[PDB]
Design an enzyme around this catalytic site. Structure first.
Site, mmCIF file in Angstrom:
data_model
loop_
_atom_site.group_PDB
_atom_site.id
_atom_site.type_symbol
_atom_site.label_atom_id
_atom_site.label_comp_id
_atom_site.label_asym_id
_atom_site.label_seq_id
_atom_site.Cartn_x
_atom_site.Cartn_y
_atom_site.Cartn_z
ATOM 1 N N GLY A 119 0.852 -1.163 0.000
ATOM 2 C CA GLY A 119 0.000 0.000 0.000
ATOM 3 C C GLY A 119 0.878 1.199 0.000
ATOM 4 C CD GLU A 169 2.716 3.493 5.440
ATOM 5 O OE1 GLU A 169 3.648 3.048 6.165
ATOM 6 O OE2 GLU A 169 1.787 2.790 5.019
HETATM 7 ZN ZN LIG Z 1 2.789 -0.511 8.488
#
Ligand SMILES: [Zn+2]
Ligand code: NA
Ligand code: NA
Ligand code: NA
Ligand code: NA
Length: 866
Positions: A257, A294
């Site tokens: 992702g 993130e």
């Molecule tokens: Zn992660």
């Protein structure tokens, strides 16, 4: 390929403290020069083993002396006779253009970019590619100026120059030591959205977001999300960013992702690009989720990293918890909780019952890329949330603070994290640790009794975890078990015993245990396992009327939804058996009544209403059965949708029209009204055919945003309305040059109930917008068919299995990571009937036999065939 074992961990014989990389970039032939300062901690006779894969070794020096004492083995360069401290220099060659697996340095469109987690860095140079080796990186990049005007790596840009022949170079220095899985490099041409964020403390952080030329209009929501992420990590966790730049790059070709590379995140562009006419509310909220995730890794991942890969959940479970708290704090806590529980029960339970079953901390791994899982991530987070539940927020934060104080700047273990929480809080987590080492889903059984003589209520709670393929021994867990007791007017009955109040989170620590409560002035209706206080299956013999009571009265929105789920489960199971015997749907009237009540409740939050009127998925429904009959499930889902659409037709249409919004906002109240509205539309598509085709067609054409246009398009496919093909052609015609938008369309095509769906999916392999070279496309078409169209994937003739074998035969050589993702529906054979197993077994044996079989597939196939 051989398995590695967590109990085999040991400190490395050598460390590297600093590495200076020079990349001479070209897509056919990249020359890497790597100068590492090293230190031998072990014995003089212990050689240095450097991991490396698919490197062409050019030279090896030690303190500038060309070295003769080394050999190359399978996956390594073994260097002997070294001093205690020395400068290793490796020059080697690699080839990004060849790299279809998208691991190491590779080509995304015209850009070059890296992916180094988990073990990709060894595909760039020979290194200590293990996350307990931390070093200070400087990265010099040299490239063609026209082709690659932007040259990025971690940290700060400290030097730069021009050269002859239209080449230039840039150099980066990332002052924080890191394991190499956190290295990144990107070269190419981009539009850049630039903005800034000022920390609580006054540090001004340049934010830079790199996207393909032409896409700057679809970047500000990501930018905004990053700022919300930074602000939230400050407010909730007391954490500030620690560098001066924060870079994010959006690439189209990416296996995962997104990736938390220090100061230079690389993102699959599906988690960055949004515009109201290309992206749904789900997309906006996913972009918020992943950006945050993130960003939160900067501390729970980067500033503190993993000692070894068996500790993956130490960063991921924790970082997932953080993204869930972020999303929950900013949006609807209840809707996030609901969704996360659907994911847990509907998908992860399945994994914990499969041959790939493992603990959140695995004990054995063959290919560590197979362990980026629902279990490690989602169950991991639930484990973190249990600690939170046991400590409360204040001690949790104290624990967080101790964890960083002890381990900032180093690599740690799951056990380390737990010890900091225990030490900071004074809550004993010895028994709690077993959650890290045991696999499978515990099943909690609850029996109760009211005694009107003594006004006491007794819960007798037991637990068992069935054996799993990986583990024959199971033991009781420390299971936080939250209850509320309701009287006949829906008021909570104070929990107490012997004149002192009792905490409502029960500690269920034994095989079997009894809890007694005094001053229970009325026979209670219990809410059990509130807010999904542990990742367990609950067994309790509810009445339908206890359940509708809770839907009416329960204090927490989660409990009201959860009660509805239990009401439905009963009748989903009824009707699946009825399907198998050729009978139509049966549903008591009072069930439909309960859902009329929700639709017409004026005071209910529409966010909740919408989730209650979202029937469990086929995957959620499947966990209700030991043997899955995927056709029966799919059909019952439809038939339940049809029945409710008819009973509630007038109500549904009214609520549909009442939630109309002319303006579009990415704002939590608007999203909820819109989610309810489109839930209403879905049922209406399964009603009177003409009115269905009119409502749906209309919405598709009148929609001023993609959330509403796709809801309609999707209803047209699902209910097979006359307007379907024409609406699908309009979309193709309009959106075919846009891959991320087309993925939505591929998913609809792949998940269609139409009888010839496989034939369509095969043809779609030649579609203008499809390509086997792009993971997003693969997953949107092939993966969605296999994974999200179980009724068709499991057609009785085996055509689905054969289709997937064909595709996997390709992907095994092209991109083993995407392959392993796609194999997962085949690994579940033991949940299906004999005739289906035999075909799936045969498909798996065929794959087992492939010539160059990837370790990614080997691990799963062999477990499945045991
Ligand atoms: Zn992660
Ligand atoms: Na080191
Ligand atoms: Na909130
Ligand atoms: Na009872
Ligand atoms: Na499932």
């Amino acid at each position: 390929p051989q398995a590695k074992y967590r109990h085999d961990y040991r400190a490395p014989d050598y460390q590297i403290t600093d590495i200076d990389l020079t990349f001479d970039l070209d897509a056919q032939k990249t020359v890497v020069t790597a100068v590492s300062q090293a230190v031998r901690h072990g014995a003089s006779d212990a050689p240095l083993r450097l991991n490396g894969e698919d490197l062409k070794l050019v030279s090896v020096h030690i303190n500038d002396e060309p070295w003769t004492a080394w050999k190359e083995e399978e996956g390594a360069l073994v260097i002997s006779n070294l001093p205690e401290r020395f400068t290793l220099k490796i020059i080697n060659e690699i080839s990004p253009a060849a790299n279809t697996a998208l691991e190491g340095l590779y080509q995304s469109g015209d850009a070059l970019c890296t992916q180094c987690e988990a073990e990709g860095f060894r595909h760039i140079t020979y290194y200590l590619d293990r996350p307990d080796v931390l070093a200070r990186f400087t990265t010099k990049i040299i490239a063609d100026k026209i082709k690659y005007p932007f040259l990025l790596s971690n940290g700060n840009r400290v030097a730069q120059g021009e050269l002859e022949n239209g080449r230039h170079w840039v150099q980066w220095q990332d002052p924080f030591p890191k394991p190499c899985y956190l290295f990144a490099l990107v070269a190419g041409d981009f539009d850049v959205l630039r903005d800034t964020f000022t920390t609580r403390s006054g540090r001004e952080v340049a934010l830079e977001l790199y996207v393909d030329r032409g896409n700057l209009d679809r970047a500000p929501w990501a930018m905004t999300s990053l700022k919300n992420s930074m602000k939230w990590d400050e407010e909730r966790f007391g954490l500030e960013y620690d560098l001066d730049i924060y870079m994010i790059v959006a690439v189209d070709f990416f296996n995962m992702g997104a990736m938390e590379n220090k100061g230079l995140n690389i993102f699959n562009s599906k988690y960055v690009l949004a515009r109201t006419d290309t992206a749904t509310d789900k997309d906006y909220l996913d972009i918020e989720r992943v950006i945050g995730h993130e960003y939160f890794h900067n501390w729970t991942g980067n500033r503190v990293t993993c000692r070894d890969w068996f500790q993956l959940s130490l960063k991921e479970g924790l970082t997932v918890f953080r993204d869930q708290e972020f999303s929950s704090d900013l949006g609807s806590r209840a809707v996030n909780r609901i969704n996360n529980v659907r994911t847990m029960r509907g998908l992860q339970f399945a994994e914990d019952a499969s041959p790939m079953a493992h603990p959140i901390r695995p004990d054995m791994v063959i290919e560590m890329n197979n362990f980026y899982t629902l279990t490690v991530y989602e169950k991991g987070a639930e484990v973190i949330r249990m600690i939170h539940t046991l400590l409360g927020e204040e001690n949790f934060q104290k624990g967080m603070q101790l964890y960083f104080e002890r381990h900032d700047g180093s690599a740690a273990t799951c056990d380390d994290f737990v010890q900091a929480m225990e030490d900071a809080s004074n809550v004993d987590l010895s028994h709690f640790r077993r959650w890290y080492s045991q696999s499978g889903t515990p099943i909690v059984t609850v029996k109760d009794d009211y005694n009107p003589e003594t006004e006491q209520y007794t819960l007798t709670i037991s637990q068992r975890t069935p054996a799993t393929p990986d583990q024959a021994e199971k033991q009781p867990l420390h299971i936080p078990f939250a209850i509320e007791l309701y009287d006949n007017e829906g008021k909570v009955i104070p929990l107490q015993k012997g004149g002192h109040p009792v905490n409502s989170v029960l500690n269920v620590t034994q095989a079997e245990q009894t809890f007694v409560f005094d001053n229970v002035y009325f026979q209670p209706v219990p809410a059990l396992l509130c807010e999904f206080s542990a990742p367990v299956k609950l067994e309790y013999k509810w009445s339908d009327q206890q359940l509708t009571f809770l839907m009416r009265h329960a204090r927490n929105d989660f409990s009201r939804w959860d009660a509805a789920q239990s009401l439905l489960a009963t009748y989903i199971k009824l009707n699946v058996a009825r399907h198998q015997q050729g009978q139509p749907l049966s549903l008591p009237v009072h069930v439909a009544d309960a859902f009329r009540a929700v639709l017409l409740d004026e005071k209910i939050d529409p966010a909740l209403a919408a989730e209650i009127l979202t029937l469990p998925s086929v995957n959620e429904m499947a966990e209700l059965f030991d043997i899955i009959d995927p056709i029966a499930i799919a059909e019952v889902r439809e038939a339940l949708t049809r029945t409710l659409a008819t009973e509630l037709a007038d109500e549904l249409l009214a609520i549909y029209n009442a939630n109309y919004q002319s303006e579009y906002r990415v704002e939590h109240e608007d999203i909820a009204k819109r989610t309810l509205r489109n839930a209403c539309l879905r049922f209406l598509a399964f009603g009177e055919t003409h009115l269905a085709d009119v409502l749906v067609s209309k919405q598709f054409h009148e929609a001023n945003n993609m959330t509403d246009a796709l809801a309609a398009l999707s209803a047209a496919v699902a209910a097979q309305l006359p307007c379907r093909d024409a609406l699908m052609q309009e979309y193709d015609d309009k959106w075919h040059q846009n891959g991320l938008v087309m993925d939505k369309w591929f998913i609809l095509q792949a998940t269609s109930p139409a009888a010839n769906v496989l034939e369509t999916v095969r043809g779609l392999l030649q579609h203008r917008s499809f390509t086997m070279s792009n993971p997003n496309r693969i997953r949107s078409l092939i993966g969605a068919f296999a994974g999200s169209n179980p009724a068709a994937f499991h057609a009785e003739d085996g055509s689905g299995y054969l289709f997937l074998v064909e595709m996997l035969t390709d992907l095994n050589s092209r991109n083993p990571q995407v392959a392993s993702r796609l194999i997962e529906p085949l690994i579940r054979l033991k949940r299906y009937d004999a005739k289906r197993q035999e075909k799936m077994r045969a498909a798996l044996e065929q794959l087992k036999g492939l010539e160059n079989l990837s370790g990614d597939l080997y691990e799963k196939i062999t477990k499945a065939l045991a």
